[PDB]
Paper text:
The recorded dark-state structure superimposed well with the deposited structure, showing a root-mean-square deviation (RMSD) of 0.15 Å (measured on the backbone Cα over 104 residues). However, compared with the previously published structure, we observed that the Arg74 side chain had rearranged (Chi3 57 to 4°) as it accommodated an altered rotamer of the flavin phospho­ribityl tail. The significant improvement in spatial resolution also allowed us to model Leu34, Val103, Ile73 and Cys32 residues surrounding the flavin in alternate conformations [Fig. S2(a)], revealing system equilibrium dynamics and several water molecules coordinating the phospho­ribityl tail and the phosphate group [Fig. S2(b)]. Overall, the electron density was of excellent quality and enabled us to observe variations in the positions of residue side chains (with an RMSD of 0.189 Å between the dark state at CT and RT). The reactive cysteine (Cys57) exhibited two alternate conformations, as observed at CT, but the variation of the 2Fo − Fc map contour at RT clearly indicated a change in the distribution of each conformation [Figs. 3(a) and 3(b), respectively]. We thus refined the occupancy of cysteine using Phenix for both temperatures. Conformation A, in which the Sγ atom of Cys57 is 3.5 Å from the C4a of FMN, was equally present at RT along with conformation B (i.e. 0.50 and 0.50 for A and B conformations, respectively), in which the Sγ atom of Cys57 is 4.4 Å from the C4a of FMN. However, at CT, conformation A is favored (with an occupancy of 0.70 compared with 0.30 for conformation B).
Residue numbers in the entry: 17 to 126
Write the structure that this text describes.
Amino acid sequence: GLRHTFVVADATLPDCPLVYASEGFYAMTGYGPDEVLGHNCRFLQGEGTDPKEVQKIRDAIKKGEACSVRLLNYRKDGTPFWNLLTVTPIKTPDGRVSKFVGVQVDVTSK
Ligand SMILES: Cc1cc2nc3c(=O)[nH]c(=O)nc-3n(C[C@H](O)[C@H](O)[C@H](O)COP(=O)(O)O)c2cc1C
């Protein structure tokens, strides 16, 4: 989908914290860099987020593999939205994962 957001997480640190987010990520979610750089993206989850979809992502990250999931997420103001998320590992020439990138699409309106 054409409208989307983009983030980079640092896989060389144990909890894959965010190191970069696009202008649209901040604007869509309602958070700014001074609130979410250095943090794992799970802050977007909440009461209704499907733990089985969360587990798929967790498992893909541990295996250094790409994954696509649909997750209920929440803006800073607590309002929900449907996030079609695709995460992709970025490797060094030795095959180790350095970064994960994420593309989010708000698919609430279909
Ligand atoms: C690059 C990247 C982007 C991510 N973007 C989101 C996101 O937009 N929304 C979300 O709920 N989780 C997102 N995650 C998933 C969480 O950061 C975390 O990996 C997931 O919740 C599973 O780990 P946990 O069980 O320790 O929370 C993203 C992860 C990575 C690596």
